[PDB]
Amino acid sequence: MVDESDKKQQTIDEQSQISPEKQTPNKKDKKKEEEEQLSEEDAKLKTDLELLVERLKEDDSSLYEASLNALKESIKNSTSSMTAVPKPLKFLRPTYPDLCSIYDKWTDPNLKSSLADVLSILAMTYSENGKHDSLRYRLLSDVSDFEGWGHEYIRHLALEIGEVYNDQVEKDAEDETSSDGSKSDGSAATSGFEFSKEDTLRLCLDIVPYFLKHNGEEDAVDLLLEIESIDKLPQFVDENTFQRVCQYMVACVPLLPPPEDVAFLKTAYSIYLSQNELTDAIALAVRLGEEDMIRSVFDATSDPVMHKQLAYILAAQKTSFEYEGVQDIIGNGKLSEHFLYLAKELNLTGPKVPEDIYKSHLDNSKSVFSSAGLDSAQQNLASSFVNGFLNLGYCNDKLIVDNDNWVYKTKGDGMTSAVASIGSIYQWNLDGLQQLDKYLYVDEPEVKAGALLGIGISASGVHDGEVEPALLLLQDYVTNPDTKISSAAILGLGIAFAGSKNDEVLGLLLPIAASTDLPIETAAMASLALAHVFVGTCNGDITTSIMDNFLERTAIELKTDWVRFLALALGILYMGQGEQVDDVLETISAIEHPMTSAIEVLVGSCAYTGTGDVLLIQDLLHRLTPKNVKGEEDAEIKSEEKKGKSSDKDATTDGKNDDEEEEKEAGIVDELAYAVLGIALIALGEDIGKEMSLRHFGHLMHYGNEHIRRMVPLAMGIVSVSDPQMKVFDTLTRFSHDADLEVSMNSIFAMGLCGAGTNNARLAQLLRQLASYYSREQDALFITRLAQGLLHLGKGTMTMDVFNDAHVLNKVTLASILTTAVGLVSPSFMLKHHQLFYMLNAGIRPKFILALNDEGEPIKVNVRVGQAVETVGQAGRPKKITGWITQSTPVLLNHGERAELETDEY
Amino acid sequence: EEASGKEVEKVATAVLSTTARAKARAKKTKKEKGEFYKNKYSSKPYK
């Protein structure tokens, strides 16, 4: 206790009858008082260590608290663990826990903070020797259940994660940085960090993302690979190990800068690759956009068998899924050589099989015609369009169309949009060519423009097997001098091949089809083409595009509306990237206008896309500044300025939309509540600001892909009957599809009630109807959405034209663009390898707001839904495979993936 | 400065604090993660 005679060899035993108490008092005193006794203290280190083990299996708190009170002082606050230095350093095996007994078991906030730091210093230094590693391992695996071990291992490994901070904040590091008081360079870091990874996998699951994100390196995710692949078969089974990982990786997407954010994913693909669930590995490869990643996954699955089996099929269906098309081109190769079949295997690799399931789906759901028939007034315009929009996605619309009477009768620039929407019926399906050639071959150029857009959309179905490809038709039609006819011809092509970039694709769109001497709005469609094709795979933010962006702008700037269209197409090109977008800020800006600076901030939001650490605060300084300066003070040349001022509003809304997509499962839920509030604030500060914010708001919902989709839109939609602008409904309904005729049935019924009671303009009526007919696609037919489906945080490839027109005035002319909406997702079927179009049962889970799961993986419990359903909108998308009951296990794990399910039946 | 002129300054001070705090909460979070009453007479002459 407090006696110096209690240090005798005899007096260990005499003391220990009472209780072991030889360790502190006398011993401590002599070690901290005479150097000579450190030579003795060394041999007795072993003896002491054991006394802590015994009184832990007979754990009793009192006799550590009180006893090792005065012990705290010698260790590091007085001796400072460095006389001749070597001697205290070696004795850090049995004294590190003695510090911890006043850190941990004695409780007080005040002592948690203080001693945390001290421990960090000691761990690190004794992990140079590497004997602190050894102390960690023997608690994780313990020797007996007690309250000791189970707190001690948590704290030790927690502190290492702590250390890396001190060197980043300041150059100084060391004790002056009070965060851990540790230098944090190799020695107790390198050697300790390697052990650290192994420990945190076994019991731990909730400090692991904290370890990975703080380092903020792809080196950390690279060491992690190896460590995890060792344990993945004995300690735990692959199934458990794989989910635990999948929890870590998703969590760290918030709180990482752009260059780090993508780098975290790249490495994550490798972890997946080795791990036996190859399904996950392949989806993330596309998102990244690097062909090489896709190649490896497909080949590994295909080659080991010379028979058909589950293996060939499995490889082939994963490559079919993307409607970007990049996977499709690649996958042809090994399977082709083999000739088990060309007919079957080749087809399932490419997008030929998805067409066929779409046909099947069209018969199942039918296509209940219920289109508006209204003639006359501006109500005429609306009717015509509604026929297209109602029956959006692959259908048979032939009989109504066959009467060209109403198509020609559709007045104005409205006429063009009526033909365009005939084009929309024919998505991802060769069939419907027949109707298009009629309009194309006759009358105004106008009818021909909608028809040509239509060919691009019809050739989309099959473009890898190249059946009546897009390219052939439209090539002839580029040449035709008229700007309208050129431009439309090149946008359908852009859509068809999509994220696919080939020698055929590049050279066609290369000489722009926009007349620089005319500023025709449907001749804007040339820049749209370039934006679309580049996105849907990695974006080099290319220079060829900038040369032309400047070219259209310089020539004509008198029409402000048009030049805003080019600005928006440029920003969109870059999206799907946040790391090369910084580089192109310099490049774009080199040229001088107040107009070029307007473009700068738009593209700025795209750069900082990843987390709200940067994003949310830029779009808030920006927002406040008009409002705040104006509030404070109170309490050709023209046309350039006007663009300037308009873009700031836009830019604030855009940065908010882009950020929330990325965030936490947790963070989505709070940003939504806030968004509604933000409407009141902007309304307070500035009248003008309110108007722009509203229209964007409905797109906020679509872009972020909120979790919910059932209750919230409709709640919001009531409020926005009162708020000005009726484009709020147009953008809002593209989010609000969900299962079709659930939400949307309520959207059409409600909307026409309020418009007939309160009518304030026929223009106003035009929007209300359009939106509501759009919303439903009959009986839950495959839906448009920003996400790919396969990519959970997926950004649009052909669903980005929406935002462009929301910012600018409301006219019938803009609607042409809106016809593009390719976004259709497969109706899943439980396949074996005989390509069965019929499900046992599958579980859907509507709940998608959970913050308990970070993975956002549907709980296995679920609720059972039938066969030949569509993979419904968000808050329904999470689908798990019911199969457990009939002794069956998914090979292809769906977490809410688009993906066709596949099982191995035991 | 008279009453009107003194008042411009008093207000200006009030205004800066309100504005300051309206950006402060968020910015701060998100910063770190990513000679004499009677001098009588002097010897010193003056003109």
Curated annotation (Swiss-Prot), chain A:
The modification Phosphoserine is found at S16, S19, S178, S187. Residues 1-11, 24-34 have a biased composition (Basic and acidic residues). The keyword Calcium does not apply. The modification Phosphothreonine is found at T24. The keyword Repeat applies. InterPro entries: 26S_Psome_Rpn1 (IPR016643), ARM-like (IPR011989), ARM-type_fold (IPR016024), Proteasome/cyclosome_rpt (IPR002015), RPN1_C (IPR041433), RPN1_N (IPR040892). One of its GO terms (molecular function) is enzyme regulator activity. GO terms for cellular component: cytoplasm; endoplasmic reticulum; nucleus; proteasome complex; proteasome regulatory particle, base subcomplex; proteasome storage granule. PC repeats lie at residues 417-449, 450-487, 488-522, 523-563, 566-598, 714-745, 746-780. Residues 179-191 have a biased composition (Low complexity). GO terms for biological process: proteasome-mediated ubiquitin-dependent protein catabolic process; regulation of protein catabolic process; ubiquitin-dependent protein catabolic process. Residues 1-44, 170-191 are annotated as: Disordered. Keywords: Phosphoprotein, Proteasome, Repeat. Present with 306000 molecules/cell in log phase SD medium. This is 26S proteasome regulatory subunit RPN1.
Swiss-Prot record, chain B:
N-acetylated by NAT1. Signal peptide: none annotated. Residues 22-31 have a biased composition (Basic residues). Belongs to the proteasome subunit S1 family. Interacts with UBR1. Present with 4750 molecules/cell in log phase SD medium. This is 26S proteasome regulatory subunit RPN2.
